[PDB]
Design a protein around this ligand. Structure first.
Ligand SMILES: Cc1cc(CO)c2cccc(CC(=O)N3CC[C@@H](N)C3)c2n1
Lengths: 156, 39
């Protein structure tokens, strides 16, 4: 199938019409998404088949065809771009300065941008265009608005 | 059965729409990978 680097929509026909359940990143021949999007199911790329290789429900991450490749980190200071890919709509950069998820195991980047759940898997970039993590695992706050972690995996 | 379609390049776009705030949030992460507000 198509193994050009870039961002891709994750679609299903198991419901009415063709439905976008999420987004993902192709890099170095590996496809990267969020576990809650695919549930670790295989994927089609034309005639090509993509088999899961690594995943973890707690990180809510999954890689296809190879190990996790994305190792760039939010620097803790600079603004970032959410390369959002919403259902039925074209790819759109949105610049923001991330907030902070404070946890017992450490502090994580967070972006306060609200988009349909089908946007889950859209990447977040540094000023050099490197992927520092994926969008779509987070929390609903006092206001009723959505805040997402900058979810990054470990490269071996 | 699920399939992928390409939707763009991964590029920093100068003078993109600038928006969103920057909250500091106390959160817990459970074994199911669901975040929650530690209040
Ligand atoms: C309720 C809601 C609302 C919005 C936006 O208003 C979302 C935006 C992106 C992604 C998700 C999905 C999400 O955060 N999780 C699913 C799996 C679990 N671990 C968290 C969203 N979930």
């Amino acid at each position: 199938g198509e193994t050009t680097d870039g961002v891709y929509r994750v679609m299903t026909r198991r419901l009415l019409g063709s439905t976008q359940v999420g987004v993902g990143v192709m890099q170095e021949g590996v496809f990267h998404t969020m576990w809650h999007v695919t549930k670790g199911a295989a994927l089609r790329s034309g005639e090509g088949r993509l088999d899961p290789y690594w995943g973890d429900v707690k990180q809510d991450l999954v890689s296809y065809c190879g190990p996790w490749k994305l190792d760039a980190a939010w620097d803790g200071l600079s603004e970032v771009q959410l390369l959002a890919v919403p259902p039925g709509e074209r790819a759109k950069n949105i610049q923001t300065l991330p907030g902070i998820f404070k946890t017992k195991d450490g502090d994580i980047g967070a972006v306060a941008l609200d988009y349909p759940a089908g946007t889950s898997g859209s990447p977040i970039l540094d000023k050099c265009g490197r992927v520092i993590g994926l969008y779509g695992n987070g929390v609903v706050i006092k206001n009723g608005s959505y805040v997402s972690a900058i979810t990054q995996g470990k490269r071996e | 059965d699920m399939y992928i379609e390409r939707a763009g390049d991964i590029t920093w776009e100068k003078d993109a729409e600038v928006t969103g705030n920057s909250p500091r949030l106390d959160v817990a992460l459970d074994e199911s990978g669901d975040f929650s507000l530690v209040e």
